[PDB]
Structure formats: structure tokens, C-alpha cells
């Protein structure tokens, strides 16, 4: 009896993330794409590369 | 302090059946409310339901 | 509509009972977490969660003592 | 809409025993640093901070007695 | 009156026991509260608080103990 | 994949909350050993390492008390 | 990412209430030490470093005693 | 071949396959820690991963024992 | 063929290959120092060694510990 | 089989909530809408406002 498996594969994942904020005044506070509260010293952004 | 309230449901419920045969409907539905702050995340609900 | 039990009549009068001590503590342990170190959040926090370890300890005690008061009588049908 | 327990209320005797003294230390400690090397203001951050101090002791460990307390009737019902 | 079973009497034996502990407590840290730095409330509060808890205690045990009796006894009917 | 239990989730709360305690914590101690002396860089290490000291004692105390509180429900199925 | 906790806080207070010290004295310092054995100088110096004493001393001093608070009600959790 | 599994086979297989990569996690975990003890950081994370694990084992007995007893009590009757 | 080792056994002896050879370094620093007790570089080793050895000691026997336990509640649920 | 559902809602609320309570020289505390008065020391009413 012959049993034959045969397997074949290709995977690609290239791109960024982006979210941060930003305090101004101290009186009004904005953010971007943050699903959580921030501490409030502002101009702090992440850009998360895959290749 | 003075309030007043005012409230109002109407409901439908429709069945086909042949002559003689007995039968049943059946049904149930929740209803969902956004609680005030959204940053606190949560929900308030209800089920009605109907036989 | 779904079918619950005795026991799960005399459970839930604890959960209707203590009415919102389970979000209570959820916030009050995110509060803490942002600044560990604050009097006020920590003399917060050591009440609720006291009230919580009491809570679902005189819950489940209880459904157990029903459980044996029942499975005693079901033993006589026999 | 609060909930509040048995140690909650215990413990909230304290802070409505004490009326004031969670804004006074702030406030001496405020003043204090613009001119750390008065005696006067030295002497009267001095009292403050100890009767703060104390304050907090003491209503921990009263918290901590009950929790103990309760945790030992619940025990016996099983 | 309402029905009382043996237990009943058992436990009431103690709270009619100790006549005003239940209620001295609870003074002693109203006044505690007022002024938590003074030496002869302190005094007077750590001795309050620990005869509530060695009474607690004691009823609960003996209460069980009761209930341990009784079921063995009534197991053997059968 | 990165299996998380609930402990594992109440753990990770003050590893977020504590943004970059532990990153400073290391950097004030990679500067203040070239220079000891420097009471500017004394003081700020003070302060860091009183923060992480706290941090590390709340985290583990809570996690102890959650256990608890499962293993107790767990033993009444039977 | 500049996270800072209570004590930071408390610290931080103090170093922002002294507006200028820290420079004042690097001032005088080098005037002092340039032309030594200037009364004029010397008047002004040992005031500026005096009051710099104080002002370490105290700062730590205040941590020291908010660090042994929080601690001891940390105990208190388990 | 297969292992013929019953049913109490099946209510533990459930556990096994809930925690997916636990078991393996609580190794790894104890192999850096005892390589560098003193550090707070594999510590930390240790004693939850312990935990869990002990959580787990437990649940998973104390249940398999009671559908034995109902199991048994049902058959009882037969006779 | 070797002394036969348990499941307890094959995990206390991780630590011990874990601490490849502290063992000796605490020895050997306690009789250099003791060769000449005032001396601060000596002081300042020992110290660090002898923290070293209580900390691994000690964790040591705690998870042996757990690890009873664990079984224990295992063993019970066969009767 | 067709099987259709449909759903539309409308939400919306307006307005401000009074309440708050002031130490009036050591000789009255005085509160409005409080349904067990905490009487906060010193003085600050608050108005809550949503829409």
C-alpha cells in the first residue's frame, strides 16, 4: 500500500501601524487610534513596521 | 424636583396554521442601551419575550 | 425564557444583591494600576477587594449546603 | 449610584471623622516647599504628616480585624 | 413569638450574655474617629474590639458543634 | 499563540500601567554609577526604586489573593 | 513614556518650588573660588549652601516617610 | 490503533485542549528561573504561570469525579 | 542504573545544574574573608554571594512544596 | 427559506443636573438634591451636563 502527501506554501505580510497623541495647553488632549488613556506630555507617536 | 413620563409599545405577533392542526410561535429579543461615559465601557439590557 | 434551577434562584439573589461590586472593583484595580502608589487608591481598594473574596465565598457555601439538604431527600424514594 | 458594604462603611467613618486633614497636609506640604527652611511652617508639617500617618494605620488594620472576622463564620456553614 | 428551634436558644444564650458589648463597639469608634491620636481611646478601643472578636467566634464553634450532634443522631432513625 | 489565564491578565494590568518604570529604574542606576557623588542623581534614584519596590509588592500580593479566592470555589464541587 | 508615580510627584514639588537653587549656587561657587577671601562672597556663600542642605535633607526625608505609608498598607492586602 | 477514549476521556480532553501551550510555558518559565534566580522580573511572572497550573490540575479531578458518581449512581438501579 | 530520581527529584536538581557552581564560589569567598575580616573588598563579595545562596535556597524548597501539593490533591480522587 | 430582519432606532437626550451641598460659616450645612448628604466641607455645588 502507498500513502503519498504533498505540501506547498507561500506567506507575505509587509506594512506600518500607526497611532500616538498629542497635549496642548494641558487643556485639551488628542489622540489617534489609542484604545487607552494617556498621560498628557503629548507629541508621542509609534509607527509598528512588518516586512 | 418635578418629572414626568410617558411610554408606549405596541407588538404584533403573526401565525399560519392549517385547519385542525395545533401550533405554536415563539420568540424572545434583547435591547441594548450605551451607558454616559463611554471610556467606561459598558451596557445596559432587556429581553422581552413572547409565547 | 432559558430554564434556571433553585439553585440558581438562590445564587443569583447574591449577584442582584451586591449590584454593581464587580464593576466596583474592575475600575478601582485599573485606578490603582495607573499610579501603584497613592494612599487613597490603596485604601480604596484593600475595602473592595475584601467585600469581593467575602462575597463569592458565602455564595458558594451556601448552594453547596441546598445541594446536600436535596441529594438527603432523593436518597428515600429508593 | 454608590454600593457600599459593612467594610466600606466602617472604613469611610474615618475619612468623615477627619474633615479636613487630607487638604490640610497638602496644602502645608504646598507651602513648605516655596521656603523649606522656615521653623514655622517646618513645626506644622511635622504635626500633620503624624496625624496623617496614624490616620492611615489605623484604619487599615481595623479593616483587616473585620475581614478576619467574617471570613471565620463563613467558614461554618459548610 | 416567633418560632425559635434549640439553636436558636444556644446562639441567644450568648448576644443576652455580653448585654451592651454590641453596642459599646460601636461608641468606642464613633469617639475613636474624632481624634485618632489619642493614646486613651486607643486603649480603650483595642480591648472593645477584641472581646467582640473571641465572641464571635465562640458562638459560631458552639453552634456547629450542636449541629454535628443532632445529625448524627437523626441519621440513625433509618 | 500567547495563552493568558485570568491571573496572567490581572498581572499585565500594572505591567501597562507602570509605562517605563522599568526602563528608567535601569538608566538611573546606569548613570549614577559613573558618578556617586551626585545628589542631583541620588535623589531621582531614591525615588525610582521606592516607585519599583511598591510596584513589585502590590503586583504579587494580588495575585496571591485571586488564587485564593479560585481554590475556595473549586473545592465545594464536590 | 515619562511616566511618574506620587512620590516623583512629591519630589518633583519640592524641586519646583525652589526656582532657581540649583543654579544660584553653581553661581556663587565659581565667583567664590575665582577671588577667595572676599567677605562680600563669602557672606553670600554660606547662606545659598546652608539653605541647599536644608532643602536635600527635607526633600528626602518626606519620601522616606510617604514610602513607609504605602508599604505598610500594602500589608495589609493579603 | 487510536486510543478508544470514553467519555470522562472526552470531559478531561477538554481541559487538555483549553490550555493550549500552559503546559509548556510552566517549563520553560522554571528553566530561566533557575538559571538566574534573583531577578524579579522571571520571578514575577513565574508565580502567576504556577498558579494557573495548579488552578488547572484541580478543576480538572474534582470534575471528572462527580460525573463518576452519577454515572455509578444510574447503574446501581439496573439490579 | 543511576540512583532512581522522581518527578520531585528531577526538579530540585534543576536548580543545582541551574547554579552551575555557587556552591564552591560561597565557600571559597567565606574562607578568603575570613582569612582577613576587615577588609572592604572582601566584605563587598560576600555579601552578594551569600544573598545569592539564600534566595535560590529558599525558592527552592517552596516549589518542591507546591509541587506535593498538587499531587496530593490528585491522588486523593482515585478512592 | 428567506429569512429578513429589519431595525432602525433614534436616541437622544439634552439637558444639565443640579445638586451639591455648602458649610455655611459653622452654622448650617445647607444641600440640594442630595439623597443622603454627604456634606463635603467648605463649599463647591456641581452641575453635570450631557448631550
Given at each position: 500500500?502507498?500513502?503519498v502527501?504533498?505540501?506547498k506554501?507561500?506567506?507575505?505580510?509587509l506594512?506600518?501601524?500607526?497611532?500616538?497623541?498629542?497635549?496642548?495647553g494641558?487643556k485639551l488632549?488628542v489622540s489617534?487610534?489609542?484604545?487607552?488613556?494617556?498621560?498628557?506630555?503629548?507629541?508621542?507617536?509609534?509607527?509598528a513596521?512588518?516586512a | 424636583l418635578e418629572?414626568?413620563k410617558?411610554?408606549?409599545?405596541?407588538?404584533?405577533?403573526?401565525?399560519?396554521?392549517?385547519?385542525?392542526?395545533?401550533?405554536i410561535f415563539?420568540?424572545?429579543?434583547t435591547?441594548?442601551?450605551?451607558?454616559?461615559?463611554?471610556?467606561?465601557?459598558?451596557?445596559e439590557?432587556?429581553?422581552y419575550?413572547t409565547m | 425564557?432559558?430554564?434556571?434551577?433553585?439553585?440558581d434562584?438562590?445564587s443569583?439573589?447574591?449577584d442582584?444583591?451586591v449590584?454593581n461590586?464587580?464593576?466596583?472593583?474592575t475600575?478601582?484595580?485599573?485606578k490603582?494600576?495607573?499610579?501603584?502608589?497613592?494612599?487613597?487608591?490603596?485604601?480604596a481598594?484593600?475595602?473592595?477587594?475584601?467585600?469581593?473574596?467575602?462575597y463569592?465565598?458565602?455564595q458558594?457555601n451556601t448552594?453547596?449546603?441546598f445541594?446536600?439538604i436535596?441529594?438527603?431527600?432523593?436518597?428515600?424514594?429508593?
Amino acid at each position: 500500500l502507498w500513502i503519498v502527501d504533498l505540501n506547498k506554501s507561500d506567506l507575505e505580510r509587509l506594512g506600518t501601524s500607526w497611532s500616538g497623541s498629542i497635549t496642548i495647553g494641558d487643556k485639551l488632549g488628542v489622540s489617534l487610534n489609542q484604545s487607552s488613556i494617556s498621560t498628557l506630555d503629548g507629541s508621542r507617536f509609534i509607527a509598528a513596521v512588518n516586512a | 424636583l418635578e418629572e414626568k413620563k410617558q411610554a408606549t409599545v405596541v407588538s404584533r405577533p403573526v401565525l399560519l396554521t392549517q385547519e385542525n392542526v395545533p401550533a405554536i410561535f415563539d420568540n424572545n429579543r434583547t435591547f441594548y442601551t450605551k451607558l454616559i461615559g463611554e471610556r467606561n465601557v459598558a451596557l445596559e439590557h432587556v429581553t422581552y419575550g413572547t409565547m | 425564557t432559558p430554564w434556571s434551577g433553585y439553585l440558581d434562584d438562590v445564587s443569583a439573589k447574591f449577584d442582584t444583591g451586591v449590584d454593581n461590586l464587580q464593576t466596583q472593583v474592575t475600575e478601582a484595580l485599573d485606578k490603582l494600576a495607573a499610579k501603584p502608589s497613592d494612599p487613597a487608591l490603596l485604601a480604596a481598594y484593600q475595602s473592595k477587594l475584601s467585600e469581593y473574596n467575602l462575597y463569592r465565598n458565602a455564595q458558594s457555601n451556601t448552594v453547596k449546603v441546598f445541594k446536600d439538604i436535596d441529594a438527603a431527600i432523593i436518597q428515600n424514594f429508593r
